[PDB]
């Protein structure tokens, strides 16, 4: 809730390889 680095720095660290890999193993981005 309050730990404001923690709510959101593991989200990103998430996102960023899961939206990476959307664009590789789903085919519509690869670099």
Do not use: H, R
């Not at 709510?7 to 998430?14: H, R």
Request: proline letters at 6%.
């Amino acid at each position: 809730g309050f730990l404001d680095i923690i709510k959101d720095t593991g989200k990103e660290f998430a996102v960023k390889i899961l939206n990476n890999l959307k664009c590789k193993l789903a085919g519509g981005c690869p670099p």
